[PDB]
Design a protein around this motif. Sequence first.
Motif, mmCIF file in Angstrom:
data_model
loop_
_atom_site.group_PDB
_atom_site.id
_atom_site.type_symbol
_atom_site.label_atom_id
_atom_site.label_comp_id
_atom_site.label_asym_id
_atom_site.label_seq_id
_atom_site.Cartn_x
_atom_site.Cartn_y
_atom_site.Cartn_z
ATOM 1 N N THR A 130 0.854 -1.189 0.000
ATOM 2 C CA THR A 130 0.000 0.000 0.000
ATOM 3 C C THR A 130 0.882 1.227 0.000
ATOM 4 O OG1 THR A 130 -1.965 -0.808 1.202
ATOM 5 C CG2 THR A 130 -1.547 1.509 1.339
ATOM 6 N N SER A 131 1.885 1.117 0.844
ATOM 7 C CA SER A 131 3.016 1.940 1.022
ATOM 8 C C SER A 131 3.412 1.481 2.336
ATOM 9 C CB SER A 131 2.725 3.407 1.086
ATOM 10 O OG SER A 131 2.787 3.864 -0.248
ATOM 11 N N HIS A 132 4.493 2.001 2.914
ATOM 12 C CA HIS A 132 5.015 1.543 4.196
ATOM 13 C C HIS A 132 3.980 1.317 5.256
ATOM 14 C CE1 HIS A 132 8.113 0.364 2.610
ATOM 15 N NE2 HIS A 132 7.533 1.181 1.750
ATOM 16 N N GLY A 133 2.850 2.011 5.172
ATOM 17 C CA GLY A 133 1.787 1.651 6.058
ATOM 18 C C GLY A 133 1.120 0.296 5.930
ATOM 19 N N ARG A 134 0.945 -0.357 4.748
ATOM 20 C CA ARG A 134 0.182 -1.634 4.767
ATOM 21 C C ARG A 134 0.484 -2.776 3.820
ATOM 22 N NH1 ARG A 134 -4.706 2.108 2.516
ATOM 23 N NH2 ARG A 134 -5.492 2.886 4.507
ATOM 24 N N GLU A 135 0.427 -4.028 4.345
ATOM 25 C CA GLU A 135 0.564 -5.249 3.559
ATOM 26 C C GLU A 135 -0.531 -5.420 2.591
ATOM 27 O OE1 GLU A 135 -1.703 -8.551 3.480
ATOM 28 O OE2 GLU A 135 -0.560 -8.758 1.630
ATOM 29 N N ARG A 136 -1.757 -5.202 3.054
ATOM 30 C CA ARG A 136 -2.859 -5.718 2.322
ATOM 31 C C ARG A 136 -2.983 -5.201 0.967
ATOM 32 N NH1 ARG A 136 -4.421 -6.609 7.513
ATOM 33 N NH2 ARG A 136 -2.651 -5.865 8.701
ATOM 34 N N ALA A 137 -2.634 -3.941 0.740
ATOM 35 C CA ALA A 137 -2.252 -3.433 -0.556
ATOM 36 C C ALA A 137 -3.157 -3.668 -1.783
ATOM 37 C CB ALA A 137 -0.809 -3.889 -0.732
ATOM 38 N N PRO A 138 -3.085 -2.836 -2.782
ATOM 39 C CA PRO A 138 -3.950 -2.829 -3.949
ATOM 40 C C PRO A 138 -4.740 -4.009 -4.387
ATOM 41 C CG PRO A 138 -2.196 -1.325 -4.333
ATOM 42 C CD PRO A 138 -1.887 -2.055 -3.045
ATOM 43 N N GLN A 139 -5.997 -4.120 -3.977
ATOM 44 C CA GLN A 139 -6.895 -5.101 -4.527
ATOM 45 C C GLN A 139 -7.107 -4.838 -5.974
ATOM 46 O OE1 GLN A 139 -10.388 -4.837 -2.277
ATOM 47 N NE2 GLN A 139 -9.451 -5.636 -0.369
ATOM 48 N N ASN A 140 -7.128 -3.551 -6.311
ATOM 49 C CA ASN A 140 -7.133 -3.163 -7.673
ATOM 50 C C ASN A 140 -5.730 -3.390 -8.133
ATOM 51 O OD1 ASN A 140 -7.338 -2.243 -10.156
ATOM 52 N ND2 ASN A 140 -7.830 -0.101 -9.701
ATOM 53 N N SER A 151 -1.402 10.133 1.952
ATOM 54 C CA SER A 151 -2.175 10.105 3.223
ATOM 55 C C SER A 151 -2.192 8.848 4.128
ATOM 56 C CB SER A 151 -3.623 10.672 3.021
ATOM 57 O OG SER A 151 -4.276 11.090 4.232
ATOM 58 N N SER A 152 -3.294 8.626 4.889
ATOM 59 C CA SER A 152 -3.603 7.535 5.817
ATOM 60 C C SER A 152 -3.248 7.702 7.278
ATOM 61 C CB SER A 152 -3.112 6.120 5.329
ATOM 62 O OG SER A 152 -3.280 5.022 6.247
ATOM 63 N N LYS A 153 -3.979 6.959 8.125
ATOM 64 C CA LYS A 153 -3.812 6.748 9.533
ATOM 65 C C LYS A 153 -3.622 5.298 9.879
ATOM 66 C CE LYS A 153 -7.112 8.114 12.516
ATOM 67 N NZ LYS A 153 -8.034 9.189 12.847
ATOM 68 N N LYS A 154 -2.900 5.090 10.970
ATOM 69 C CA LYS A 154 -2.383 3.877 11.532
ATOM 70 C C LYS A 154 -2.823 3.650 12.967
ATOM 71 C CE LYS A 154 1.808 1.050 12.517
ATOM 72 N NZ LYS A 154 2.828 0.443 11.621
ATOM 73 N N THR A 158 -1.374 9.045 12.191
ATOM 74 C CA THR A 158 -1.183 9.009 10.735
ATOM 75 C C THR A 158 0.036 8.338 10.121
ATOM 76 O OG1 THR A 158 -0.415 11.254 11.010
ATOM 77 C CG2 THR A 158 -2.574 10.897 10.093
ATOM 78 N N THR A 159 -0.146 7.691 8.946
ATOM 79 C CA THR A 159 0.676 6.739 8.158
ATOM 80 C C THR A 159 1.765 7.233 7.160
ATOM 81 O OG1 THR A 159 -1.319 5.477 8.276
ATOM 82 C CG2 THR A 159 0.233 4.539 6.868
ATOM 83 N N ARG A 160 2.597 6.284 6.556
ATOM 84 C CA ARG A 160 3.773 6.372 5.622
ATOM 85 C C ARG A 160 3.608 5.989 4.093
ATOM 86 N NH1 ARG A 160 8.510 3.766 9.386
ATOM 87 N NH2 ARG A 160 9.706 4.255 7.487
ATOM 88 N N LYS A 200 8.024 5.626 -1.483
ATOM 89 C CA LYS A 200 8.532 6.513 -2.466
ATOM 90 C C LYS A 200 9.037 5.939 -3.704
ATOM 91 C CE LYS A 200 10.076 7.691 1.413
ATOM 92 N NZ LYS A 200 11.095 8.052 2.414
ATOM 93 N N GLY A 201 9.503 4.709 -3.757
ATOM 94 C CA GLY A 201 10.044 4.099 -4.974
ATOM 95 C C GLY A 201 9.072 4.221 -6.077
ATOM 96 N N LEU A 202 7.942 3.592 -5.856
ATOM 97 C CA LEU A 202 6.790 3.665 -6.700
ATOM 98 C C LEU A 202 6.351 5.112 -6.908
ATOM 99 C CD1 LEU A 202 4.693 1.734 -8.192
ATOM 100 C CD2 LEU A 202 3.242 2.121 -6.187
ATOM 101 N N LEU A 203 6.480 6.044 -5.920
ATOM 102 C CA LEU A 203 6.015 7.420 -6.099
ATOM 103 C C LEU A 203 6.789 7.936 -7.231
ATOM 104 C CD1 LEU A 203 6.118 9.469 -2.813
ATOM 105 C CD2 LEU A 203 4.098 8.748 -4.075
ATOM 106 N N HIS A 204 8.088 7.761 -7.125
ATOM 107 C CA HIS A 204 9.060 8.127 -8.071
ATOM 108 C C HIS A 204 8.889 7.461 -9.354
ATOM 109 C CE1 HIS A 204 10.050 9.873 -4.698
ATOM 110 N NE2 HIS A 204 10.146 10.803 -5.617
ATOM 111 N N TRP A 205 8.383 6.245 -9.377
ATOM 112 C CA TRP A 205 8.044 5.582 -10.596
ATOM 113 C C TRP A 205 6.966 6.378 -11.279
ATOM 114 C CZ3 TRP A 205 3.073 4.374 -11.438
ATOM 115 C CH2 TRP A 205 2.833 4.186 -12.800
ATOM 116 N N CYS A 206 5.922 6.754 -10.565
ATOM 117 C CA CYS A 206 4.744 7.347 -11.124
ATOM 118 C C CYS A 206 5.081 8.615 -11.831
ATOM 119 C CB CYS A 206 3.662 7.598 -10.089
ATOM 120 S SG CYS A 206 2.100 7.839 -10.972
#
Lengths: 104, 85, 149, 133, 42, 153
Positions: C38-48, C79-82, C91-93, C96-102
């Motif tokens: 999801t980003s450093h905040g979460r495993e569960r990550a993009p279902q999409n 964004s996000s909260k933890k 609030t969450t992390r 950036k790798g992917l940010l930078h990819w985008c």
Amino acid sequence: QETQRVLVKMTSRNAKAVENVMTELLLHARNEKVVLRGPVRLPTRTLKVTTRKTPCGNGTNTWDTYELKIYKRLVELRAPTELVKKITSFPIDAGVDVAITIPH
Amino acid sequence: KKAAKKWSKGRTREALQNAVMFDKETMDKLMKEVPKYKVITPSIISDRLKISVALAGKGLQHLCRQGLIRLVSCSSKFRVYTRAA
Amino acid sequence: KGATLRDVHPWRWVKICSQHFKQEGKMMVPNCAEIVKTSHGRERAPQNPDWYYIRCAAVLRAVYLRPGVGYGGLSKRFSSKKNRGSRPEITTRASKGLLHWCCKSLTKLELLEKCKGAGHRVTKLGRKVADTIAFKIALRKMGAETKAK
Amino acid sequence: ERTFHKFTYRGHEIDPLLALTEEEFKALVHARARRRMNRHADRRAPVLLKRLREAKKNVKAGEKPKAVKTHLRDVVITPEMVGSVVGIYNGRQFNAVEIKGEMIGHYLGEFSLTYKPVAHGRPGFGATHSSRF
Amino acid sequence: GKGSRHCVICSNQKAVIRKYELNVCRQCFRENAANIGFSKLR
Amino acid sequence: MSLTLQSESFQHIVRLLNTNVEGKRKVPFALRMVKGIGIRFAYMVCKKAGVDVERRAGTLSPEELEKISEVIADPAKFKIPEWFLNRQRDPKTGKTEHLTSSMVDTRLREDLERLRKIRAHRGVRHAYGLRVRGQHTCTSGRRGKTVGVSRTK
RNA sequence: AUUUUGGGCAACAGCAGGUCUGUGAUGCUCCUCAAUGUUCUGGGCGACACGCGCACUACAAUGUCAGUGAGAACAAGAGUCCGAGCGGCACUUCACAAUGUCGCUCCCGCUUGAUCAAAAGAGCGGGGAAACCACGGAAUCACGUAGACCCACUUGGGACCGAGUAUUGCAAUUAUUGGUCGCGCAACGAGGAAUGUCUCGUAGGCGCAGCUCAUCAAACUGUGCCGAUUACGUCCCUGCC
């Protein structure tokens, strides 16, 4: 003329002292070639201090807070530098930092 | 539960028959119940215990893209249905 | 006149513009990635699984609006909260790798541009195309009124 | 003469240890410990390493060479000081440990006994409450 | 962490209010607000 | 949801690859199973093999199982990355491992006794029965009330 | 529209409270160096049968997950001081080392653009002095919309933890902190007898400033975002004049 945007910035431990400062210099400087667009004042900055009081050992561990707001006044002039320097001959008190800057 | 505790001083609730599954009766029933009510909601499907208001609601959407029930809000989620005409 | 990106719901539109980058096969994932936290905040990550497009859609959404939006901004829109544990609800992390990819990708897609080699701001073409897209999706709705007015 | 310790610290036996620098030997180890050395330079041991080394010399078939006191608590066990005996300060004691090989590559902090044992124990001498007066 | 402050009024780690380059004991601070200009806010 | 009427896809509850797999599940935690400790869903490994909600755990296809069994034990053969890899420097291989099953148990015994064996406060603190911090350690142990209790008399 | 608002201030006696843990306020009363001084070192106060006091969190669809939302409070930050880093100089010096000087950058605090990585993490060039000007035209938390869970520990939950990488610190070894991925079904399904506070954009939830701060708060002291019963009496209870 070749004006100088003079910024005379006045920051002060109270609003009080500085306005007195501000005004008088400007009056003095003005009269006449000193030409000023009215004084704008940047955010009053505030200093907070809460303290653990009492050495209750026992009794209430209650705590007390003192503050110092610091007041910023700016006036800009499109004015002569030497004239500025001519009027700039005020020894001025403390509690009133007054900075003068020549940008444009 | 597997939990030893996880239950209070007074509260008590009994089980439902709604599930993930695929069932001849369910599917077929669904076809006959989705017309049936004058208002059809995912919740009533849940209440007729075969399939819960969740995927049963999908059953309703995927019966209502077949028109069987009329999707009311002009959007999703808290859409609802009435039986079709 | 009409409805541009300033006027249109990405809820239909990003979901379609995501597809503009998909459907067309223009950019997709980078070599380094395709798994996605999801980003450093979460495993569960993009279902999409389309997250990077979605991302691109959203970085693009940013870039026309906040012309000149740097790397650090993208971390924030993230964004996000933890709920950490028997601990604070804070609030969450943002990864950036992917940010930078985008950032690398939408500029390669020429919808983003690195404004003043920095903060991104849109390509002209991007936004005409966006407005175009907006209209196409807009009219045929599964809601109430006007495919029959 | 003397015995053996069949041991593998990251895929390495004591000989494979022996043909490393304490640097590369640490590469095997996790980020802080590898960092620790990085952050370092030489050893903090100049005399110590000789007191170890000398005693490392002194070994005889039975018995032992003596123990080097130190207040240390972060040494990586390397064969070069192996078979030595170490006095580890903790205020109360310069606790003594021979470092045979089945200790090697570990950190000293992993052997420093920094505590007294409360754990609702019992008096050993003549104690009674707490030491709070 | 408690050993590097050494209160510039007082050499103290304890009793010193740690605030904005100051290093005075809490009492010392209570004593000083006037010359400095801090007046109660709450 | 589908209008599928099926009973053989309403499936259940099968113990495979020395794991348990329940019915239902969005699919993940059936795959999460076997503990002792991380055994080895990775989430990702399984998700990477081509498994999803579109089958749940409940669909329970054999085909799938074979594919999982295959992906899991050479995870980064599947490029399923090694940077996570629950074990990463053993110490007897000195390496990497996507650790599975009872060999993690084995690994647990060996490593925990030595890890514990060379001793220190810190060491004993995780070891004898403590949370490896909390300053005020007695308060933790809450209603498990008996960390173990010890006397040498 | 009411002693209008929240405070601040606030009588007089009184309480061997507490106040040796400020005090460069100190009685009387101790050691003064084979001292309990001082440094240094190393430890400790942080040790788990348990009894508590606060807090915090979970137990969950009223939720959890994946994603999507054009949401700003309030308020921080660049010390001085002629071998820190760098540099120049000086002299030593076969070469080193050396020393010394001078200067810069000052033992250079916030920090931005952004590359290369799973990832956290590594970085030229930049920028900002409390700066409403750089970290502030973005970007505040629970909103609102599309998608997994057809409500069962689902895994609610994460205590628990294992390698693994980054960072703090002289030193973490009484894990400084992060990170990562696995990883959990601990307790825990909302808690007895008892019981704590509370009557307006506020309870209350919800989140964020700000400092402790090498490094670290659920604390501290604020900020916000969101957003309400009846009570308005009664004087019983329980208590003060």
